[PDB]
Structure 1
C-alpha cells in the first residue's frame, strides 16, 4: 500500500486526460492483485498461509 500509492499519485497528478487516470488505476489495482497472495498461481501459498492462522485461533482455547 505504499509503492503502489506513490505510482498512482504520480500518474494521476501529472495526467491531463481521463483515459490516462483510468488506465493508471487499472494497473495500480492489478499490481495489487499480483503483490497480494490472491493470484491464480499463489493459491497454494494462500492455502499454506491460512494454516498458520489456524494455530493462532486454536491457541486461545
Structure 2
C-alpha cells in the first residue's frame, strides 16, 4: 500500500481520459491481488499461512 498506492495515484492524477482512470483502477487492484496470496497458483503458500494462523489460536488454549 505505498508502492501500489503511488502507482494508482499517478495514473489517476494525470489521467486525461476517463478510460485511463478506469484502466488505472483495474491494474492497481490486480497488483494487490498478486501481492497478496490470492492467486490460482499461490494456493500452496496460503495453505501454510492457514496453519501458521492455527497455532496462534491453539496457544491461547
Match of 1:19 in 2: 19
**Distance between the aligned counterparts of 2:55 and 2:19, measured in 1?**
47
Q: RMSD over aligned Cα, in angstroms?
A: 0.6
TM-score between the two structures when normalised by the length of structure 1: 0.96
Runs of 4+ in 1 over 4 A off after TM superposition: none
Q: Structure 2 unaligned runs (5+)? A: none
**Distance between the aligned counterparts of 2:6 and 2:41, measured in 1?**
27
**Distance between the aligned counterparts of 2:47 and 2:12, measured in 1?**
36
Q: Structure 1 unaligned runs (5+)? A: none
Aligned length: 61
**Distance between the aligned counterparts of 2:48 and 2:41, measured in 1?**
13
